[PDB]
Design a protein that fits this description.
homotetramer; 124 residues; alpha+beta; Phospholipase A2; two-stranded antiparallel ribbon; two-stranded antiparallel sheet; 4 helices; globular; hydrolase; Pancreatic Loop
Chain lengths: 124, 124, 124, 124
């Protein structure tokens, strides 16, 4: 779920607060999504977006709490390393990976403050 | 003049073709100009656009062939480093300084192939 | 095969010669590997390297010419768009996607001249 | 002094905690020196390392509390801009400039989280 995704970001990016840093970046990094990603970090959030859609369409995701936002999965954060544990619940595993990939991508991507709190027009 | 600017870029970033690499990139590099550069390279050609305006308004730039495109200044390209030799004619000097700064800004800047021939829009 | 990979790169990055631009960049783009990728474009190469290690293990990859270096696959480059066509031969399809993915981000990734023709030590 | 340098960074890049962000980054940021900077940020920390060395040799700096870490200069932070106020004491003024240049460079520079605590290896 989104609470767990925040936690994963806190694992690959220890001192930063996701709700502040990645909450209004580029075109896709937070609030809605339209236009072309201003950079790699934006692409991580874009990939994160459509990785959630795929999950919402995975014939393997059950009901009501099967969504990427509310579906709790099983994961581990050891020494800044994320590992998905779900095994038989192919849907939870999928959602856990969307978050694991995004959290790692965010860590390895260039954070360019010129691309933070952009102007809408840059996203048409 | 334009031929020399090309040479400078060719001096600073040898592994590129100036024409194909810098005249259809972003929203200020080559053609037009308008609305927030998509990246570093883009602002380089924005700075080089402002600089070409100043030059035209420089009192010391008067008469036919004093314009940035056609004005032939004096310069040197040694071991990858640019030097403007104009002292007397402070107009040519100013023009050469625009090109030099630009050619140096270009080399020193991350080039994103995808930023070539962008939409319109991103520049609204 | 590698000849086709080169072509794909010529599709997403026109007028640029892959054998000059991407053959000795970062720690992975070009001969050898080892170390940690200096940037994104380097990772695009690292990813490509391992995507090739995977295909050499894919149980669906047959005989002498099943390897990613010599396995001719089927694709299309129309208007700068890459598409893999194989279906029955899932191996070819896999190899074609390694090349399509890499060629695709080589274009989205920033090319930093400072991370080209690096120093060995910079890769341990 | 170092307290003011901290504040300067706070001035140009408020969304970050100076200590945690700029003291254990790359091959030069904060801890030790050596090797080739992993990136632009690492490289601002290299020139803000050299500059401190200059200041120490600067004949114009003499006596106890003239050193960059402890020398207290006069500066101002207004709407994200920094200006060094020292005129008479050109020792303080030089120390302030090193700080201004770095803190001001820390901002317009891409931050790569993954570059924190790099492998004392790519610093050879």
């Amino acid at each position: 779920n989104l609470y767990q995704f925040r936690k994963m970001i806190k694992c690959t990016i220890p001192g930063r607060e996701p709700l502040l840093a990645f909450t209004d970046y580029g075109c896709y990094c937070g609030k809605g999504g339209s236009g072309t990603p201003v950079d790699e970090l934006d692409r991580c959030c874009q990939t994160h977006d459509n990785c959630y859609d795929k999950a919402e369409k995975l014939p393997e995701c059950k009901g009501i709490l099967s969504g990427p936002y509310v579906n709790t999965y099983s994961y581990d954060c050891t020494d800044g390393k994320l590992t998905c544990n779900d095994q038989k619940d192919k849907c939870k595993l999928f959602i856990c990976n969307c978050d694991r990939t995004a959290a790692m991508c965010f860590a390895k991507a260039p954070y360019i403050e010129a691309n933070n709190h952009i102007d809408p027009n840059r996203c048409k």
